[PDB]
Design a protein around this nucleic acid. Structure first.
Ligand SMILES: [Mg+2]
Ligand SMILES: [Mg+2]
Ligand SMILES: [Zn+2]
Lengths: 55, 96, 347, 34, 100, 1236
RNA sequence: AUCGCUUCUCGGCCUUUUGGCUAAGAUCAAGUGUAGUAUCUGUUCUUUUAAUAUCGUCCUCUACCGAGGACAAUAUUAA
RNA sequence: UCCUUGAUGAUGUCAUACUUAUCCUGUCCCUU
């Protein structure tokens, strides 16, 4: 809920976090949408910690 | 497929292009004159278009210093030429 | 198919592949929809139009590039910069599966096959010394005429004494691109020129130099006779100069041996092959990569270097008197009178 | 038919400068009377 | 000679040449929107438009970054200034600016 | 470079201000010494190159070749290169105009255009590269050729001027060592005797050549016009971007003839150092000059302390023999001029720290003072205005009663010689790094030479590899490896046996090798973690590898020596080299490169052997053959195969080419490692075929190598005739002309695509990349890691849903096999499920690819494999039977298809995610990357021998797998002659006469043309009516399709659509023909029809189309007057029927009639006129108008068969000059029926 | 002479004007053929058959409504 | 006081000539 509330607050409606913590784009992205939706090591590292805990 | 004989039109465009671009941009000048490269434009400038090139008649003391330097430095016209104040080609031609 | 009325006529639009097979040619980006509900379902814009038999057809007809068409477009400006991870060239490639401009792929393909290819072919064809109805075509250096090939003599001062050529009637660009009937008629001229030059006490070298198969030069099959005390040394010079030829650290293992196998079933249909033959016994072959460190002559350089001839003969030629000195064909015809097989009317 | 003959005008650099001044490829027109 | 004159004349780059054309296009679309709005006000149709910007409308509405003139030793509360004569039957865009 | 040109303008200004430095007394001394030397040698001055010089075109060709060698590596050319190559090609195409131009510049020109300068960065120092005008460069190159040829005729240079043509630099060091050994009593120290070795340089020799005195000395040597040209050529303007000065004092190194000036000025200073007397004793008399380290007498050797003296270009090497008296006297003179009260001479004395402590020079007061004193005496002999000699750049070594060793360092490697009479104490000979150099007189080994590589050459190699790792074309993986291989073979084939004695250089080789491998790995990103397969590096470039060479003890893991193959029995696992050993260790280059001592001993042997061989072969009167020559091909000092160079007769005029190649560094910007040799004169000097061969043997053989690759995905039967094709990639005109090197930042791994595709079953492994292992898009491919160009390749191979179509094509084909074997097994009806299409790329579960509906029951067996034999058993499970079809994409770790089949069976039948209708079905697993297939499940009786044959048929005939294989070959650009579809070639002819319907199709006479002369005389080409010849070899029915000229309205030049009209008419004929008479095989005479018909018969998938190596004379059948009059007189396309077996089948077998018809048609193709006479000899013999050939009884048929057989055989023997009475029956069969 | 207006010449203000840095930042080159856009010139509308696609009634299912099937001619193009 | 409304056809289109985000190049002529 935290990770996709962070997604939905940044208006990144074209991304999808599935239930096994894979982040995938719903469609094919433009250059501007791809420059906008590039996350850093904090979001992805927390996402992968949550993937290990869900395993 | 570059070069050949220089006409008056190319030389006047070369003069005006030195007036615009300067004496340190020769590939911008040689883009303005086709069938002439940058080395050719630079050489044509320093050998027939620089207004320090004395195109007048040789005096007496000039040719005396010419014979003295040519006996003094054998076949060294790029060294003799800034001393007697002429182009090395003119210096060699008048010596011959 | 297409017409392309080339200033009066009709030319049937055809395309050649790498293997030289000739195929009839039939006649803002919107980022189409490469997904579904959350799932990736197709990459390219026409992944649901092609059937399996249509894929078999396009695989048989298709020219051998399939990467260059995308690489040219994404090699261009305003494409962004690959910033290491999260946007590689692999997903830059995926993002360029846009919507082509209403059969624009078809129009460009048609335009390339038709107008560019035809123009190149016509240009080669009109300025060709071969392919009889051309512009230059000396026409008095002809000695033979056969079913589909003929003997000719070169346009220039002719490196050796009995220098002759084995030329087909049409542009074919290669011996591997020939059919078996034309090759068996070239081999009859070859077996006749060997028997003629052996009875004169000379020897034979048959050269074939095929450069890059996209320039459409005419096929010509050399025949350079030279003395028997020099022709016995001829496999050594070519064995030495083929291994010290084309770019070091090659891929294809230089100096193919054609003594038993022969050219047709030694070098695949599609790639350059300088080849040499020593009389009747086949000699050596060399698949040519790196078309700049391989001279387009290469065989007359070795022959004119072992005969100690000046280099003006092999590169660029020396022209002769346009009718006077080019009556060496009279001398060649009285040599080739007992050995003519292209007629029986000798009553 | 082209004729090679020595001319009389003999175009110079300052003539090129004067004929280059009147090209006016940078002077924007004034806005219209509104 | 023609290329010589055309290259001895030029001093501007890509961005200056696109900005000059962009200024001419902005002037053209301004006169076009001016004609449309003048027709809508002449016949009389009060279609309102939008604005989507943070700053910019603060210029005509009020004094932008107003500093009051410092006051002292002389009363200056009584005196005032007289506004400009409108005269909207002779006045032109060139007239407010002055001659070039 | 900008700081250098500031200092250089400063130096030229200080020369023009501060006058000559030369101090004219000293210049008169130099001039007069040179005059007395040249009159001492009776030297004949070089004239002007004459107007009718017979050798001038040879030297012009040599000079043009050397100028053309500069712009051969690159392909990006500006205007100056294009003008330069245009002038070279004009000088080829008209040599006498060029020679007139060159002689006119040599007589007249004295002011020259400005030259450019830049610097080659060698990472430790800089080298000037000079840029001269092309016309001037051609004139200079011819002048240089002429000067060196006339200097070698006139014997200008004595043999101590060292870069001579017939001496490699290791041969120079070897001659120096054995010349020290062959001096008289050179190792004796009993009465007090010292050896001194001085090694130094002429510090600023180039920089200080006064051009006036240079004019004086050149006018002593050559004609005054040539000397004025050479003097006025050195005085030009040097430019760099803003900077212009005039070279008024030094010389230009980058001139084509500057090598001659350098070696001659060094000769003048050799006369200054030695003196005229000792230099004349070294050169010998002019009537009988001696070679390099040889005097006339023993008494002339020991006359003076200077014994041996060589000069490499600016490096000086003198050897000194002193008696104790002369040594003490010269030390007294040095201590007189330079006293030392504090014994400080032992402090500043440099010694070589490469050798161990017992091996270096000891510090004794006498030896240190003698070394400094000999250096002082040689240093006083040179005026500091001419050149100087500095102590910090030189090394002196004294051998005495206290020093058992003298150290020296001549070429790029250092060496010390140690006599056995001095302190060795163990007379050993085991090391390959040593030289056992024998005394000449006694023929006994006196001393040993120990060879190490100099530290400067090691740092040179390290900077070379550092340059390879830079240079932005370093992401191509073959650019890197080829530059590495070139630098490595330059290093090894220069320093052959000194490499293994130098441990730091071996460690440096290992380190640089791992660095360029790490560069390749970072190019694949690969990870920091190891177990990256070394098979992708060291594999020869013909198998798709990099062809990387090796000089380090790297080993391959045992897990790489596993491979397999699927035959008719099943899968067979083969293994390389398993007993207990781990000796698979990359054949590193030192064993396969011959040491120099073996070269030098072997070369005199093989040249005397070749001399005797060609002497006995010319008296026996036979020209030399490739076998006896192949005995001694790669052996010699100039390498015996160099006698067969393209032009040896013009390389006899190329003199002074060692120093010319050693001064190409100042002319060409590219640095080569073979600056000391060239293949034109010296030969190849390395051969690595044994190395490549047992590299292939060490990696596991060719079979064990190709299992790492997608070779099985290409599905070539053999690997033999496979040729690679880098001529059609993206590196093309668009790439070549792409301007903007920031293009090569995203599109930088696109050269690497084919390589990355080829070795993809090892790069995309689990055990090479610890990774998250995502599934690729619509595939059963799992991509381990993020290999830069693999995903582009796998998307372009599987474009347009290829997994789904391969799956539904195997399901449909296996159903269709089940659609015809109903009444052999126990059935009702087979049925194909319509599941979701997203099941091919679903590894976790699957549902049902077919369902069978058996009549009563099937006691099936048990789960077993597709390649098992026996054991039918338990329960019956009525009405239900499922198969599944799994498609995988295996890698090197996991491509065992049977283990995969049983694993997925036990995982799919024992869970709840995948639910099957029955527990009694089978799944069939197929590996698309390896073309392997197997199965594991419940086999009911009579199903396993059906599924074996069915899968074996489908794995080589499925049209979707064909698209897969051809797209893999497409992306790999890998071609093949020698395997094809299996032809009819020889042994299959017996299969022509089976119960099937087989056709022969001949389109030889479709596009036939007639040539006639016009009013211009120019011959033109007009078409005639053609035909298509279709023949039944099992009934005799003929289909003649007349192709009219009208169709040819539309090209009429080269045609090329003829093949297509023939394939279209054959397809239309099969389309109109009913299904009862449709062919099973269509065998075509011409191979070019094999691809179009296979297109136009895609609607008829059951037709096999085969080519013929065995050619048939079916073109001659249209030579018959009936057929020719039917074709040529026609005006409408039509299908006409015939039978060439006219009435033969009543009494003759189909194959006897066919053999008779082949006899008749071949005799018509060759015999003609005589065949018609012999087949129609009598008017009373008749033929019927419903038939073609005359009515004969069977004995008459035997007679005419023997007759036409003689017609074929005698004419074959006539056209091949062979006897028909010695031919065996198989040869007679291959002559008559087809072609051998 | 002084004051004012108008010609004419000239001086001083005219930096009111060249708004950085790096390896002068680097390099230095073309021809032909097709396709698209713009401009100029010339001349046109309104007031039977072939191919492709799919409101009423009847029946069945589910909770008057919805879905499915069948039936009744319709639309386009050419002579 | 010229008359004096609740509004489903108008100016085009085609052809030829002159300059590209396509198209193909790594390329040559001619006399003594
Ligand atoms: Mg950027
Ligand atoms: Mg610009
Ligand atoms: Zn031709």
């Amino acid at each position: 809920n935290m990770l996709n509330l962070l997604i939905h607050r940044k208006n990144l409606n074209y991304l999808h976090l599935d239930y096994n913590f894979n982040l995938k784009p719903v469609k094919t992205l433009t250059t501007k949408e791809r420059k906008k939706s590039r996350f850093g090591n904090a979001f992805h590292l927390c996402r992968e910690v949550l993937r290990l805990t869900k395993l | 497929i570059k070069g050949g004989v220089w006409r008056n039109t190319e030389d006047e465009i070369l003069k005006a292009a030195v007036m615009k671009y300067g004496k340190n941009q020769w590939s911008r000048i040689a883009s303005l004159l086709h069938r002439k490269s940058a080395k050719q434009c630079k050489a044509r400038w320093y050998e027939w278009l620089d207004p320090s090139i004395k195109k007048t008649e040789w005096s007496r003391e000039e040719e005396e210093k010419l014979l003295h330097l040519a006996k003094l430095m054998p076949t060294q016209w790029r060294t003799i030429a800034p001393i007697i104040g002429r182009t090395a080609a003119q210096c060699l031609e008048h010596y011959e | 198919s297409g017409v392309e009325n080339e200033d009066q006529q009709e030319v049937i639009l055809v395309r050649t592949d790498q293997s030289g097979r000739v195929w009839p040619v039939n006649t803002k980006r919107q980022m189409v929809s490469t997904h579904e509900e959350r799932e990736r379902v197709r990459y390219f814009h026409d992944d649901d139009n092609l059937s399996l038999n249509d894929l078999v057809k396009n695989e048989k007809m298709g020219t051998a590039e399939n990467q260059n068409k995308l690489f040219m477009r994404m090699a261009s400006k305003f494409m962004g910069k690959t910033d290491g991870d999260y946007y590689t060239l692999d997903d830059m490639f995926v993002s360029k599966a846009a919507e082509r401009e209403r059969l624009g792929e078809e129009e460009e393909n048609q335009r390339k096959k038709a107008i560019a290819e035809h123009r190149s072919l016509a240009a080669q064809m009109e300025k060709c010394l071969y392919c009889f109805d051309s512009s230059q075509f000396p026409k008095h250096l002809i000695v033979a005429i056969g079913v589909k090939v003929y003997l000719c003599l070169p346009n220039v001062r002719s490196l050796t004494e009995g220098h002759c050529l084995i030329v087909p009637l049409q542009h074919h660009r290669a011996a591997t691109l020939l059919d078996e009937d034309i090759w068996e008629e070239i081999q009859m001229f070859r077996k006749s020129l060997v028997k003629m030059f052996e009875d004169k006490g000379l020897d034979c070298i048959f050269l074939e130099t095929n450069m890059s198969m996209k320039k459409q030069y005419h096929m010509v099959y050399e025949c350079i006779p030279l003395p028997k005390e020099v022709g016995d040394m001829a496999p050594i010079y070519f064995k030495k100069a083929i291994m010290e030829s084309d770019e070091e650290w090659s891929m294809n293992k230089k100096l193919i041996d054609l003594s038993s196998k022969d050219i047709r079933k030694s070098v695949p249909r599609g790639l350059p092959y300088f080849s040499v033959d020593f009389g009747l016994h086949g000699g050596f072959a060399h698949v040519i990569e790196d078309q700049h460190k391989f001279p387009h002559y290469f065989g007359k350089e070795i022959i004119g270097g072992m005969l100690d001839i000046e280099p003006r003969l092999w590169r660029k030629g020396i022209r002769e008197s346009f009718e006077d000195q080019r009556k060496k064909a009279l001398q060649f015809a009285q040599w080739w009178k007992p050995y003519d097989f292209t007629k029986s009317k000798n009553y | 038919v082209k004729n090679k003959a020595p001319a009389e005008v003999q175009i110079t650099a300052e003539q090129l400068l004067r004929e280059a001044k009147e090209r006016e490829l940078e002077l924007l027109p004034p806005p219209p009377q509104q | 000679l023609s290329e010589a004159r055309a290259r001895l004349a030029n001093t501007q780059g890509k961005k200056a040449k696109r900005k000059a054309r962009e200024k001419q296009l902005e002037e053209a679309r301004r006169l076009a929107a001016l004609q449309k709005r003048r027709e809508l006000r002449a016949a009389g149709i009060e279609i309102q438009k939008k604005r989507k910007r943070k700053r910019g409308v603060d210029y005509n509405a009020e004094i932008p970054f107003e500093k009051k003139p410092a006051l002292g030793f002389y009363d200056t509360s009584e005196e005032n200034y007289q506004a400009l004569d409108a005269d909207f039957r002779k006045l032109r865009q060139q007239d407010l600016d002055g001659e070039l | 470079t900008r700081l250098y040109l500031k200092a250089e303008q400063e130096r030229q200004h200080n020369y023009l201000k501060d006058g000559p430095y030369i101090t004219a007394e000293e210049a008169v001394a130099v001039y007069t010494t040179t005059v007395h030397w040249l009159e001492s040698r009776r030297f004949s001055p070089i004239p002007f190159p004459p107007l009718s010089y017979k050798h001038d075109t040879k030297l012009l060709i040599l000079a043009l070749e050397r100028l053309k060698e500069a712009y051969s590596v690159k392909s990006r050319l500006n205007q100056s290169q294009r003008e330069e190559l245009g002038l070279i090609e004009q000088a080829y195409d008209n040599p006498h105009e060029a020679l007139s131009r060159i002689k006119r510049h040599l007589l007249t020109q004295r002011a020259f255009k400005e030259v450019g300068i830049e610097f080659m960065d060698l990472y430790s120092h800089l080298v000037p590269v000079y840029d001269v005008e092309p016309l001037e460069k051609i004139t200079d190159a011819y002048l240089d050729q002429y000067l060196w040829y006339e200097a070698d005729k006139r014997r200008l240079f004595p043999p101590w001027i060292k870069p001579a043509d017939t001496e490699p630099p290791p041969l120079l060091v070897y001659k120096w060592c054995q010349g020290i050994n062959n001096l008289q009593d050179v190792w004796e120290t009993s009465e007090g005797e010292c050896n001194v070795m001085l090694e130094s340089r002429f510090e600023k020799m180039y920089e200080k050549i006064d051009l006036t005195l240079l004019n004086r000395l050149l006018r002593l040597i050559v004609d005054h016009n040539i000397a004025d040209y050479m003097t006025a050529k050195n005085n030009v303007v040097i430019n760099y971007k803003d900077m212009n000065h005039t070279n008024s004092y030094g010389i230009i190194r980058g001139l084509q003839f500057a090598s001659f000036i350098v070696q001659y000025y060094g000769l003048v200073m050799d006369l200054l150092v030695l003196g005229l007397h000792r230099a004349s004793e070294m050169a010998g008399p002019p009537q009988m000059p001696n070679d390099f380290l040889s005097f006339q007498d023993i008494a002339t050797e020991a006359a003076h302390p200077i014994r041996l003296f060589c000069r490499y270009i600016d490096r000086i090497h003198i050897f000194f023999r002193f008696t104790a008296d002369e040594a003490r006297d010269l030390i007294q003179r040095y201590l007189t001029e330079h006293p030392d009260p504090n014994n400080e001479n032992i402090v500043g004395y440099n010694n070589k720290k490469c050798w161990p402590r017992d091996a270096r020079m000891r510090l004794m007061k006498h030896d240190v003072n003698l070394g400094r004193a000999v250096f002082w005496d040689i240093k006083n002999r040179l005026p500091r205005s001419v050149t100087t000699v500095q102590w910090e750049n030189s090394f002196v070594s004294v051998y005495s009663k206290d020093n058992p060793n003298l150290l020296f360092n001549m070429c790029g490697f250092e060496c010390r010689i140690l006599p056995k009479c001095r302190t060795s104490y163990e007379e050993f000979t085991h090391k390959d790094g040593v030289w056992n150099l024998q005394n000449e007189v006694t023929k006994e080994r006196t001393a040993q030479c120990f060879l190490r590589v100099d530290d400067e050459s090691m740092q040179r190699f390290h900077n070379r590899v550092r340059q390879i790792l830079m240079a932005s074309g370093s992401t191509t993986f073959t650019k890197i490896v080829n530059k590495w291989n070139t630098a490595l073979i330059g290093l090894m084939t220069y320093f052959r046996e000194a490499v293994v004695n130098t441990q730091e250089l071996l460690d440096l080789l290992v380190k640089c090798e791992n660095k360029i491998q790490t560069r390749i790995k970072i190019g694949l990103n690969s990870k920091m973690p190891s177990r990256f397969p070394p098979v992708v590096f060291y594999t020869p470039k013909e198998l798709g590898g990099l062809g990387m060479l090796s000089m380090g003890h790297v080993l391959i893991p045992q897990s790489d020596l596993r491979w397999s193959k699927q035959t008719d029995v099943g899968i067979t696992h083969f293994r390389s080299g398993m007993s207990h050993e781990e000796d698979q260790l990359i054949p590193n280059l030192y064993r396969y490169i011959q040491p120099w001592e073996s070269e030098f001993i072997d070369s005199q042997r093989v040249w005397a052997e070749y001399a005797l061989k060609r002497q006995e072969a010319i008296a026996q009167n036979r020209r030399l053959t490739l076998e006896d020559l192949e005995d001694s091909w790669d052996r010699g000092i100039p390498r015996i195969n160099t006698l067969f160079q393209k032009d040896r007769h013009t390389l006899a005029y190329d003199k002074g080419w060692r120093v010319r190649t050693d001064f190409k560094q100042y002319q060409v910007l590219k640095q080569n490692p073979f600056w000391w040799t060239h293949q034109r004169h010296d030969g190849k000097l390395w051969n690595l075929n044994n190395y490549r061969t047992d590299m292939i043997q060490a990696l596991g053989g060719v079979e064990g190598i190709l299992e790492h690759t997608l070779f099985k995905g290409t599905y070539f039967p053999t690997w033999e005739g496979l040729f690679w094709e880098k001529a059609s990639g993206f590196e093309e005109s668009m790439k070549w002309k792409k301007l903007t090197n920031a293009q090569r930042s995203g599109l930088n791994q696109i050269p690497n695509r084919r390589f990355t595709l080829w070795w993809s079953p090892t790069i995309n492994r689990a055990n090479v990349y610890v990774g998250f292992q995502v599934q690729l898009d619509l595939t059963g491919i799992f991509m381990h890691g993020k290999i830069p160009t693999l995903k582009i390749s796998l998307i372009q191979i599987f474009r347009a849903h290829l997994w789904q179509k391969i799956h539904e094509s195997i399901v449909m084909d296996l159903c269709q096999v089940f659609d015809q074997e109903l009444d052999a097994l126990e059935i009702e009806t087979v049925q194909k499920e319509t599941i979701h299409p997203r099941k091919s790329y679903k590894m976790n579960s699957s549902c049902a690819d077919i369902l069978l509906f058996a009549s009563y029951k099937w006691n099936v067996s048990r789960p077993s494999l597709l390649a098992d034999s026996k054991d039918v058993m338990d329960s019956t499970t009525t009405q239900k039977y499922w198969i599944d079809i799994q498609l995988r994409w295996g890698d090197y770790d996991s491509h065992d298809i049977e283990r995969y089949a049983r694993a997925k069976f036990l995982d799919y039948t024992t869970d709840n995610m995948s639910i099957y209708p029955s527990p009694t079905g089978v799944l069939i697993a197929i590996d698309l990357a390896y073309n392997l297939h197997s199965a594991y499940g419940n086999w009911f009786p009579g199903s396993k021998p059906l599924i074996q044959q069915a899968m074996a048929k489908i794995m080589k005939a499925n049209p979707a797998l064909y698209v897969l294989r051809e797209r893999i070959r497409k992306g790999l650009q890998l071609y093949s002659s020698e395997p094809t579809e299996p032809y009819l070639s020889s042994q299959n002819y017996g299969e022509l006469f089976s119960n099937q319907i087989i056709w022969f199709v001949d389109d030889t006479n479709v596009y036939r043309v007639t040539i006639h002369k016009t009013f211009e005389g120019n011959l033109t080409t007009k078409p005639i009516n053609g035909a298509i010849f279709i023949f039944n070899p099992r009934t005799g029915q003929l289909f003649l399709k007349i192709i009219h000229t009208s169709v040819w309205a539309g090209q009429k030049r080269l045609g090329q659509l003829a093949k297509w009209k023939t394939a279209e008419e054959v397809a239309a004929l099969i389309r109109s023909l009913p299904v009862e008479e449709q062919p099973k095989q269509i065998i075509v005479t011409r191979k070019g029809m094999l691809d179009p018909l296979e297109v136009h018969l895609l609607d008829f998938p059951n037709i096999v189309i085969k080519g013929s190596e065995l050619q048939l004379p079916f073109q001659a059948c249209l030579k018959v007057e009936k057929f020719g009059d039917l074709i040529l007189k026609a005006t409408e396309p039509q299908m006409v029927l015939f039978n060439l077996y006219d009435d033969w089948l009543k009494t003759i077998s189909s194959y006897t009639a066919f053999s008779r018809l082949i006899l008749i048609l071949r005799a018509l193709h060759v015999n003609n006129d005589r065949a018609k006479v012999i087949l129609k000899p009598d008017k009373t013999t008749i033929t019927e108008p419903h038939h073609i050939w005359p009515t004969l009884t069977d004995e008459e048929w035997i007679k005419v068969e023997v007759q036409l057989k003689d017609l074929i055989l005698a004419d074959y023997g006539k056209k091949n000059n062979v006897n028909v009475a010695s031919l065996t029956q198989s040869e007679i069969r291959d002559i008559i029926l087809g072609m051998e």
